[PDB]
Short mmCIF file of C-alpha atoms and ligand atoms in Angstrom, two decimals:
data_model
loop_
_atom_site.label_atom_id
_atom_site.label_comp_id
_atom_site.label_asym_id
_atom_site.label_seq_id
_atom_site.Cartn_x
_atom_site.Cartn_y
_atom_site.Cartn_z
CA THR L 1 -0.14 -0.50 0.11
CA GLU L 2 1.21 3.31 -1.37
CA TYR L 3 0.77 7.00 -0.49
CA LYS L 4 1.77 10.14 -3.09
CA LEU L 5 2.38 12.77 -1.07
CA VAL L 6 3.17 16.67 -2.61
CA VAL L 7 4.64 18.99 -0.89
CA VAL L 8 3.69 22.74 -2.03
CA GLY L 9 4.74 26.27 -0.71
CA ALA L 10 6.40 29.59 -0.90
CA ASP L 11 10.22 29.04 -1.55
CA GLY L 12 12.14 29.32 1.64
CA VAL L 13 9.21 27.87 3.97
CA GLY L 14 10.83 24.50 5.16
CA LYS L 15 9.17 22.49 2.47
CA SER L 16 12.93 19.91 1.57
CA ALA L 17 13.76 20.63 5.80
CA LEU L 18 10.47 18.60 6.17
CA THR L 19 10.78 15.94 3.87
CA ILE L 20 14.51 15.18 4.90
CA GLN L 21 13.93 15.45 8.65
CA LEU L 22 11.03 12.37 8.09
CA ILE L 23 13.02 10.48 5.46
CA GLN L 24 16.16 10.76 6.61
CA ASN L 25 15.65 11.60 10.17
CA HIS L 26 17.85 14.42 9.98
CA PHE L 27 17.10 18.59 10.29
CA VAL L 28 19.19 20.20 6.38
CA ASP L 29 20.83 23.57 7.09
CA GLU L 30 21.43 24.11 2.88
CA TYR L 31 19.41 22.47 0.35
CA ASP L 32 19.47 23.82 -3.57
CA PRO L 33 15.79 25.95 -3.30
CA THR L 34 15.57 25.28 -7.03
CA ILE L 35 15.90 21.37 -6.52
CA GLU L 36 12.82 19.10 -7.00
CA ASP L 37 12.89 15.49 -6.02
CA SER L 38 11.04 12.79 -4.83
CA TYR L 39 11.52 10.26 -1.87
CA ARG L 40 10.63 7.19 -0.88
CA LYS L 41 10.60 5.47 2.88
CA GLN L 42 8.82 2.54 4.23
CA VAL L 43 6.24 3.28 7.69
CA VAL L 44 4.10 2.10 9.96
CA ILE L 45 0.88 4.51 10.13
CA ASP L 46 -1.29 3.40 13.15
CA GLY L 47 -0.02 -0.22 12.47
CA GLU L 48 0.18 -0.46 9.25
CA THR L 49 3.09 -0.84 7.27
CA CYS L 50 2.89 1.71 3.57
CA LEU L 51 5.07 3.10 1.35
CA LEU L 52 5.25 7.19 1.03
CA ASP L 53 5.83 8.68 -2.05
CA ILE L 54 6.19 12.73 -1.55
CA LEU L 55 7.90 15.17 -4.06
CA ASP L 56 9.37 18.26 -2.52
CA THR L 57 8.47 20.91 -5.21
CA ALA L 58 10.49 23.72 -5.92
CA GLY L 59 8.28 25.13 -8.66
CA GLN L 60 10.52 25.92 -11.04
CA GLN L 61 9.25 26.32 -14.90
CA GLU L 62 11.38 23.52 -16.87
CA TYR L 63 8.67 20.64 -17.96
CA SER L 64 8.87 17.70 -15.20
CA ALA L 65 7.04 14.35 -16.83
CA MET L 66 7.39 13.44 -13.21
CA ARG L 67 6.30 16.57 -11.71
CA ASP L 68 3.01 16.45 -13.76
CA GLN L 69 2.52 12.50 -12.88
CA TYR L 70 2.45 13.43 -9.31
CA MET L 71 0.51 16.07 -9.45
CA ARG L 72 -1.79 14.32 -11.44
CA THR L 73 -2.07 11.00 -9.01
CA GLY L 74 -1.02 12.87 -6.69
CA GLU L 75 -3.58 11.46 -3.32
CA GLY L 76 -2.61 14.67 -0.70
CA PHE L 77 -0.75 18.19 -0.46
CA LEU L 78 1.02 19.23 2.31
CA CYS L 79 0.95 23.39 2.19
CA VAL L 80 3.06 24.82 3.85
CA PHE L 81 4.30 28.56 5.42
CA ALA L 82 5.94 29.41 8.08
CA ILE L 83 4.95 31.34 11.14
CA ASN L 84 7.80 33.73 11.03
CA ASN L 85 7.14 34.82 6.85
CA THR L 86 3.36 36.53 6.48
CA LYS L 87 4.28 36.16 2.47
CA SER L 88 4.28 32.37 3.02
CA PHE L 89 1.06 32.42 4.85
CA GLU L 90 -0.91 34.69 1.90
CA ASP L 91 0.92 32.76 -0.62
CA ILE L 92 -1.73 29.21 0.88
CA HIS L 93 -4.67 30.29 -1.23
CA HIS L 94 -2.58 30.08 -4.95
CA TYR L 95 -1.69 26.89 -3.87
CA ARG L 96 -4.96 25.68 -2.78
CA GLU L 97 -6.62 26.78 -6.34
CA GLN L 98 -3.35 25.14 -7.64
CA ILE L 99 -4.30 22.01 -6.41
CA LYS L 100 -8.04 21.78 -6.79
CA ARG L 101 -7.63 22.76 -10.61
CA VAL L 102 -5.59 19.73 -10.71
CA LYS L 103 -7.69 17.26 -9.29
CA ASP L 104 -10.90 19.11 -10.53
CA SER L 105 -12.55 19.01 -6.83
CA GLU L 106 -12.85 20.60 -3.87
CA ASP L 107 -12.71 17.73 -1.62
CA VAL L 108 -8.93 16.77 -2.12
CA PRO L 109 -6.58 15.48 1.30
CA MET L 110 -4.83 18.33 2.25
CA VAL L 111 -2.88 19.44 5.35
CA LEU L 112 -2.27 23.12 6.34
CA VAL L 113 1.41 23.37 7.69
CA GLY L 114 2.97 25.93 9.70
CA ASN L 115 6.32 25.77 10.08
CA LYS L 116 9.33 26.80 11.78
CA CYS L 117 7.53 26.92 14.50
CA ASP L 118 11.54 26.85 17.06
CA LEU L 119 11.52 30.17 15.92
CA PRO L 120 10.07 33.57 18.43
CA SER L 121 9.69 36.26 15.66
CA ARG L 122 6.07 34.58 14.88
CA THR L 123 4.20 36.92 12.63
CA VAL L 124 1.23 34.55 11.79
CA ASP L 125 -1.08 33.40 14.73
CA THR L 126 -1.96 30.01 15.17
CA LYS L 127 -5.89 31.48 14.99
CA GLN L 128 -5.07 33.47 12.03
CA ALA L 129 -4.02 29.83 10.74
CA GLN L 130 -6.88 27.47 12.28
CA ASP L 131 -9.63 30.11 10.80
CA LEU L 132 -7.56 29.33 7.57
CA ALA L 133 -7.86 25.84 7.95
CA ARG L 134 -11.60 25.47 8.99
CA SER L 135 -12.45 27.37 5.97
CA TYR L 136 -10.68 24.99 3.76
CA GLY L 137 -12.13 22.39 6.22
CA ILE L 138 -8.95 21.00 6.84
CA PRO L 139 -6.18 20.09 9.52
CA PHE L 140 -3.69 22.45 10.58
CA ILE L 141 -0.65 21.30 12.45
CA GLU L 142 2.22 22.97 13.67
CA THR L 143 5.98 22.05 12.47
CA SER L 144 9.73 22.90 13.38
CA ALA L 145 11.86 20.82 10.90
CA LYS L 146 14.45 21.87 12.72
CA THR L 147 13.66 20.42 15.99
CA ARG L 148 11.31 17.35 14.77
CA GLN L 149 8.11 18.69 16.43
CA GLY L 150 5.16 17.40 15.08
CA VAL L 151 6.83 16.25 11.24
CA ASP L 152 5.54 12.84 11.61
CA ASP L 153 1.99 14.15 12.75
CA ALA L 154 1.62 16.19 9.59
CA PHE L 155 3.03 13.62 7.01
CA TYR L 156 0.70 11.12 8.96
CA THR L 157 -2.31 13.08 9.01
CA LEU L 158 -2.23 13.55 5.79
CA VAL L 159 -2.35 10.04 5.00
CA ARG L 160 -5.60 9.59 7.63
CA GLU L 161 -7.31 12.18 5.28
CA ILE L 162 -6.30 10.42 2.35
CA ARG L 163 -7.97 7.32 3.78
CA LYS L 164 -10.76 9.02 4.91
CA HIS L 165 -11.49 9.91 1.52
CA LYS L 166 -10.74 6.69 -0.21
CA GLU L 167 -14.36 5.61 0.88
N1 GDP D 201 14.64 27.98 12.32
C1 GDP D 201 14.05 26.73 11.34
N2 GDP D 201 14.86 26.92 10.41
C2 GDP D 201 13.95 26.09 9.25
C3 GDP D 201 13.08 25.20 9.73
N3 GDP D 201 12.70 24.51 8.86
C4 GDP D 201 13.75 25.18 7.92
N4 GDP D 201 14.42 26.23 8.38
C5 GDP D 201 15.49 26.69 6.91
O1 GDP D 201 14.80 27.51 6.59
C6 GDP D 201 15.66 27.88 5.37
C7 GDP D 201 14.95 26.92 4.09
O2 GDP D 201 14.42 25.34 3.78
P1 GDP D 201 14.62 24.69 2.74
O3 GDP D 201 13.92 23.43 3.21
O4 GDP D 201 15.35 24.97 1.82
O5 GDP D 201 13.13 25.59 1.90
P2 GDP D 201 11.79 25.43 0.94
O6 GDP D 201 12.21 26.36 -0.13
O7 GDP D 201 10.37 25.44 0.65
O8 GDP D 201 12.89 23.74 0.04
C8 GDP D 201 17.11 26.65 4.87
O9 GDP D 201 18.13 27.76 5.96
C9 GDP D 201 16.77 25.63 6.93
O10 GDP D 201 17.72 25.19 7.47
C10 GDP D 201 12.55 25.22 10.62
O11 GDP D 201 11.53 24.56 11.22
N5 GDP D 201 12.69 26.00 11.57
MG1 MG D 202 13.81 23.42 -1.44
#
């Protein structure tokens, strides 16, 4: 049983760091912001062993058959902003609209992720994101790629969203 996951959001929010933290269980200081790649890992989620197939997006212009394939056949999306980055939060709607158009549906499994919670300089409050998440009817999860806080929860919640959708 496989789950095909796509991580989207503005550049610099932590899409790469979150993916690598899940896959390789370390925090990456620098990862080329223009590199888009997929990552696979066998995980156990609520006692069910599955394969996660995750595309870490970089939003480049060059055609990628893989990118298209993941957008078309992708089962769930992580929409990521950073809590210290107001612009990244404002951009969330763009990503949501993109996803809805790709999937031609309102009911796409999706989790709103507020990354960099380890930082004190918060400009996007919890209530704001909760309200947005509620508006979309999707779960919101606070994360830190840096400390691993909520990293499993974010990806695992999305899988649970996918399972719900499956019936
Ligand atoms: N403090 C902090 N820095 C983070 C966190 N996640 C990522 N970063 C840093 O934010 C920058 C951008 O991260 P990256 O994973 O390349 O973002 P992407 O452009 O969305 O792929 C890098 O300098 C990371 O080290 C986090 O949870 N906390
Ligand atoms: Mg990246």
